[PDB]
Scaffold this active site. Structure first.
Site, PDB file in Angstrom:
ATOM      1  N   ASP A 196      -5.441  -2.080   8.403  1.00 43.06           N
ATOM      2  CA  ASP A 196      -6.720  -1.200   8.703  1.00 43.06           C
ATOM      3  C   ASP A 196      -7.691  -1.451   7.696  1.00 43.06           C
ATOM      4  OD1 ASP A 196      -5.938   0.398   6.450  1.00 43.06           O
ATOM      5  OD2 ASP A 196      -4.995   1.851   7.803  1.00 43.06           O
ATOM      6  N   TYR A 241      -3.190  30.836   8.021  1.00 45.47           N
ATOM      7  CA  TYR A 241      -3.273  32.190   7.938  1.00 45.47           C
ATOM      8  C   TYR A 241      -4.812  32.669   8.173  1.00 45.47           C
ATOM      9  CZ  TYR A 241       0.953  32.082   5.333  1.00 45.47           C
ATOM     10  OH  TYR A 241       2.332  31.969   4.970  1.00 45.47           O
ATOM     11  N   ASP A 294      -1.732  -2.144   4.943  1.00 52.26           N
ATOM     12  CA  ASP A 294      -1.281  -1.711   6.366  1.00 52.26           C
ATOM     13  C   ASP A 294      -2.455  -2.188   7.596  1.00 52.26           C
ATOM     14  OD1 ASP A 294      -2.627   0.470   5.637  1.00 52.26           O
ATOM     15  OD2 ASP A 294      -1.126   1.884   6.261  1.00 52.26           O
ATOM     16  N   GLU A 307       0.935  -1.314  -0.157  1.00 54.18           N
ATOM     17  CA  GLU A 307      -0.047  -0.030   0.112  1.00 54.18           C
ATOM     18  C   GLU A 307       0.902   1.212  -0.116  1.00 54.18           C
ATOM     19  OE1 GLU A 307      -2.339   0.001   3.439  1.00 54.18           O
ATOM     20  OE2 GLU A 307      -3.634   1.866   3.115  1.00 54.18           O
TER      21      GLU A 307
HETATM   22 MG    MG Z   1      -4.140   3.154   6.194  1.00 55.41          MG
HETATM   23 MG    MG Z   2       3.958  35.005   2.182  1.00 57.47          MG
END
Ligand code: MG
Ligand code: MG
Lengths: 721, 721
Positions: free
Chosen positions: A110, A364, A108, A31
């Site tokens: 899951d 930001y 993996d 994966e």
């Molecule tokens: Mg995963």
């Molecule tokens: Mg900037």
DNA sequence: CCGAGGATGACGATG
DNA sequence: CGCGCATCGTCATCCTCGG
DNA sequence: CCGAGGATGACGATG
DNA sequence: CGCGCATCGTCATCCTCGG
């Protein structure tokens, strides 16, 4: 004499692959490129001779059913084809023809892992007939999900490949030692040292897929076939909780890979994709809200700082970037987004012109709670919910219970497995109106979709079907002016279109003579047409030709009902009602929660009074009496203890007498004794009033305060464009 | 009659552009697509007629000097060319020819912003001669850097377009009210409401670039010309601190745009690009380390959780993703990376085969401090550093002062403006050896580059020049076996190469007959050659033809010296020495810091003794004396106060008498008085010993403890591959 | 230029 | 600083054929 | 197939 | 789940021409 594959740089190729020994060669598929390191690490242990490895990008192309062109152009299945060798067109009996004789999958461990395995089974079982009939050809390398670290005063170190497997060692022997657990939520949280161990073993990490047996072929279809979404709906209904796959088997018949490991991802896919009918949230959004409630978002902070917080303390398993986009989504306010936005978009949060994809970086921009948000999710309700346990932490609730069906307010969209969802937004005002209708045993009004700040028209054609119009106007000789596009039609979609009509195409002739933009805090396309093309336009229609008619369908309004079971609702009111009856029961629950607390305080006070009284007329002395002999003498005289949360306990976590010891010697006066008696009989009147109010009475008080708050919400929305 | 531009979707085009009125039309260029929303928001206020906007991706192509092919293929300068109109080849006098008559730049008001403006000036002044001679053609929209929020009991809301501008209102009138400040560290932290204000004004947000005057043309070259890196080195030397540009001018001669606003980014570029000679860090890495020290990284956590922490509490202005890659970099341990890695790579942190680009997601991987790391950065040194102030928070130090020159250990690379850097890693052992040489007024040994876990050979050709070899061996009839590539040569670079030699090319003929890989915790390419091609290979050389010789140059070893001035060091020992003399002075500083503290404790104790003594023989009473009359009576009797950090104060932040009041009535005994006198005369002996040790003596004690620690570091490194 | 009927894409949380 | 593709379900609109 | 000499790319923190 | 490009300085190796 060896075939060498040369257009695929990422392939670590088995020394013997493509030779007369390819049939003894296993190919390890990982994966993603990151995990590709683990396989290569393994190739050190097992040998580069009969082993090789190649990285699966991520979710791979489901080939059934799919066009030749589609799969031909798909460079990943092309990769696995060329490296395995695999001729496309004929029936398989041997593996003697290919470059590798066995293929092995490193997912993996899951849910989405299992989705990958399945996708591979589908691919192999579809693109090549006889292949999966060859016993021992498809393998699967499996990895631990939890590692336990035994610390004091000893350390054997253990591993667990299932949850229930582990939960069992826990209420078993966890008590026997000191220890701490570690979740392996994906490959590559595994240390190098550890991966080498796995591979040094791998009789206990390898499991084999049994060749195709009766009903195997069917299940693969009754899962991945694009023709069977409805059956998948039942296949999921049927799944019986707790039905997982054996921890040590070594052979895994497909038919309950699919029915014991794929349905697990399928159940998961739906949970993150589809909302709950009660709060309108998906688990990810619901975490974000909880996190805000947990801290005090009355004053703003960068969503980039709020990300790691919500994340850290709700056991989030995806990116902070993933988390942040969710926060951003909750806050967006342009027309066509959130009928009510729970979070305020302070900064560049996205705009209508692109449907919010233009938003700035999380670091930001700032959010806080919308003042109105705590008027929809009443804090008094917080004590009532069932707070999920996840990864041995407690976290957000199963669902929240706003004072109106937020799912009806904001709506929702989602694509899961088997199931899908679409509910358009409606009008908080009409909604409240029907709630009142239900409170008075009255006949409900019908509701239509409705978008905050939108100024077009929405008509019903059939029940469950609507048409949404923009505004087009003639404003001079062959001059048209668009002032409203249907909701969720973005400006730039309409722009690409006008621009094309303008310059024309190498498929179409230009038909717009001139266009200009003059949008203000609103839409304004001014369009000019040749008298010829104005004629044409009336014939084809102005709204139709100018892309200003879009449908709204209520034929797929699905949500998890209160018992967590997926449901297809057949009307808007069928949703409103379900909400109402649960929302009404929880008003009782709240009233009762609040009165139990007042009850405990009257109690508190009563014993403080008796406490003072006792000392005053001198039946109980305190000055110069030891901690024990004084509070053990209070136990004797019946006096209850009191904990942090206000709850009494009356005999031999239970609470302390600090509500009585904490009182000083300013304490023993007629003036205190009076002051006490006073607040006691006022915490009594307080209780009497509360008990008078019914559930509808309380609910209504909240609705009213909301109604006010929603007007101020509106006035700020308008004042911000 | 209007030209319509049609291959650029993102352009919001001025209604009048490309018409006989294009000369009255301004084009607004934004830093990135996210900011493009702000301009479009503005186009609502000013009008779509004479205004339009287009997004600058990010850093744009410096065109001087650059090949036709390069610029032709650059689709962004192609965009600005076609939309402005701009014919390439001739001299400019009017703007009457173009689609827009004025161009305006919306940068986000930081350093890299100014880098963008400059890049645009360069582009315009190079690609089109007469253009920047046309007065009033280049504009610049400017935005606030700080907004102050006046709260109690009043609220006018203000804005500041420089720092010094603001710092002045601060030690001026900040005191006059209640308030809180907000940094605008990029566009799009600006609210919508605010952006509309700006544009409603814009006589005070617009500033004009004066046409080209004498020395303008020169400076642009003496900044962006690829031929002038050396002059830029002096241009930066010359810059005199505090020389910024006027806040209200309205005309900005280039010549001190460049010399008052570009040098600011250029100074910044270097600071983040080049390391300090003292600790070997760049500001970003130095933050990460401080953050770890701040919390207690004796036990691991996902770098994804450690990211937001270091970030939040060191005023980081870049991504958490940016931050995380820095942490990952500090932890990587494969051969060719960190001679000593301060952070441990627990998980998938990247591997030699790709030079660490294969690393996994921050959320799946864990770090902690390397046990040895606190043996290099001694905690006792922490109290001595100058902790930078940034955004009105205090944060990491200017530099750290390890017990050996870490910059010599780990090395560094960087590319700044004017300046560049490369220092290869060296051997902690030889380094310590020279430190000892300097401690004994002895003649220094020479040092050569050296890579942890690497097993090839490094020879000197000229001083400052080295050649690094791998290992190639013959292991049979026309069979070669590579077992070592030069350091920083990755496996996959050598692999692409062998594979090419194998299959050949449409530019080259195959020359490798067969190759196989068998890497183990080490490199192992087994190569077979035709007797013909083995002949050829001896003639061309085995190391040369197999890409196993790479150079190491010490002709560009630059670093910020201790006074923060960039310096080019001409030998390895010139660095080691500078370190030594500062590292030696700070050993005095530490000794002195530690003795001042012991001194304060002897002091403490002395007064506790006098304190008890006074009560004992009864010259001072305590039982039943008020807080005031008791501690105001201690003031009388000379007794000092004592603060949180141990420091005395002797007369009328200063500290309390809680070191004397905190003592109980178990206190007034011969047994306490003795116990006190005992620890006092032991805090005396303790001080006497410390004062005996010289700076070299203490330094040496640390070196020794390090030497041990470094052996254990090595044994763990080897035991992990 | 017609309608038919097959293929294609947009939404949003994941690899 | 930008871009891509994949699953998964529904329903809408695009696009291709053949009359 | 030679050497010359011009163009190109790799490193790492930023847009 | 993958890919791209840009600045900035130095020095190395690739690549193109012309003998
Ligand atoms: Mg995963
Ligand atoms: Mg900037």
């Amino acid at each position: 004499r060896k075939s060498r594959i040369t257009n695929y740089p990422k392939l670590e190729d088995a020394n013997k692959a493509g030779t007369k020994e390819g049939y003894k060669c296993t190919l390890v598929l990982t994966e993603g490129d990151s995990a590709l390191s683990l396989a290569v690490a393994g190739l050190a242990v097992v040998g580069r001779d009969y082993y090789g490895c190649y990285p699966l990008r991520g979710k791979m192309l489901n080939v059934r059913e799919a066009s030749a062109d589609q799969i031909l152009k798909n460079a990943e299945i092309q990769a696995i084809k060329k490296i395995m060798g695999l001729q496309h067109r004929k029936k398989y009996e041997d593996t003697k023809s290919l470059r590798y004789g066995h293929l092995m999958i490193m997912t993996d461990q899951d849910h989405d892992g299992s989705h990958i395995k399945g996708l591979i089974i589908n691919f192999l079982e579809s693109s090549f007939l006889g292949l999966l009939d060859i016993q021992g050809f498809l393998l699967e390398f499996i990895t631990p999900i939890i590692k336990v670290s035994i610390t004091k005063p000893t350390k054997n170190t253990i591993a667990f490949y299932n949850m229930p497997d582990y939960e069992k060692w826990r209420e078993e022997e966890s008590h026997k030692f000191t220890w701490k657990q570690k979740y392996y939520k994906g490959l590559g949280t595994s240390l190098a040292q550890e991966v080498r161990e796995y591979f040094s073993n791998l009789d206990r990490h390898l499991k084999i897929f049994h060749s195709l047996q009766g009903n195997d072929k069917d299940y693969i279809d009754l899962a991945f076939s694009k023709k069977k979404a409805d059956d998948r709906k039942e296949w999921l209904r049927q799944y019986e909780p707790g039905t997982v796959l054996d921890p040590t088997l070594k052979e895994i018949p497909i038919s309950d890979f699919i029915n014991k490991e794929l349905i697990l991802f399928s159940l998961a896919d739906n949970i993150r994709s589809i909302p709950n009918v009660l709060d309108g949230f998906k688990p990810g959004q619901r975490k974000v809200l909880y996190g805000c409630f947990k801290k005090n978002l009355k004053s703003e902070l960068k969503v980039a700082q709020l990300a790691p917080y919500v994340s850290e303390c709700t056991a989030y398993h995806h990116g902070e970037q993933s988390l942040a986009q969710t926060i951003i989504g909750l806050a967006q306010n342009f027309v066509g987004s959130n009928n009510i936005y729970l979070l305020l978009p302070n900064g560049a949060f996205g705009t209508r012109a692109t449907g919010g994809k233009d938003a700035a970086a999380a670091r930001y921009i700032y959010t806080e709670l919308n003042k109105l948000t705590r008027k929809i999710f009443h804090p008094a309700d917080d004590p009532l919910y069932k707070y999920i346990q996840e990864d041995e932490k407690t976290v957000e609730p199963e669902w929240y219970l706003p004072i109106l069906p937020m799912i009806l307010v904001n709506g929702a969209e989602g694509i899961g497995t088997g199931w899908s969802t679409y509910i358009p937004p409606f009008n908080p005002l009409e909604i409240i109106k029907n709630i009142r209708h239900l409170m008075n045993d009255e006949e409900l009004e019908q509701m239509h979709p409705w978008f905050r700040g939108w100024t077009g028209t929405i008509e019903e054609i059939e029940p469950l079907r609507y048409r949404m119009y923009g505004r087009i106007e003639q404003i001079g000789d062959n001059v048209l002016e668009i002032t409203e596009l249907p909701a969720r039609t973005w400006t730039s979609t309409i722009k690409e279109y006008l621009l094309l009509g303008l310059s024309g195409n190498d498929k179409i002739k230009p038909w717009i003579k001139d266009m200009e933009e003059q949008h203000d805090d609103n839409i304004k396309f001014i369009i000019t047409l040749s008298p010829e093309e104005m004629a044409k336009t009336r014939k084809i229609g102005f709204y139709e030709r100018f892309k200003l008619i879009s449908p709204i369908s209520l034929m797929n309004m699905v949500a998890f009902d209160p018992h967590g079971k997926i449901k297809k609702y057949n009307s808007v009111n069928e949703i409103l009602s379900e909400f109402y009856y649960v929302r009404l029961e929880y008003y009782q629950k709240r009233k009762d929660h609040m009165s139990e607390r007042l009850q405990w305080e009257v109690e508190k006070y009563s014993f403080q009074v008796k406490f003072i009284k006792m000392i005053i007329e001198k039946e109980l002395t305190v000055t110069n009496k030891p901690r024990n002999a004084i509070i053990q003498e209070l136990e004797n005289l019946g006096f209850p203890r009191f904990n942090k949360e206000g709850k009494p306990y009356y005999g031999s976590l239970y609470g302390t007498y600090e509500y009585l010891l904490g009182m000083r010697i300013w304490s023993l006066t007629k003036e205190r004794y009076q002051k006490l008696l006073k607040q006691k009989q006022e915490k009594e009147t307080e209780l009497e009033n509360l008990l008078k109010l019914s559930a509808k009475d309380i609910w209504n008080t909240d609705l009213k305060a909301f109604e006010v708050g929603y007007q101020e919400f509106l006035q700020r929305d308008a004042e911000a464009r």
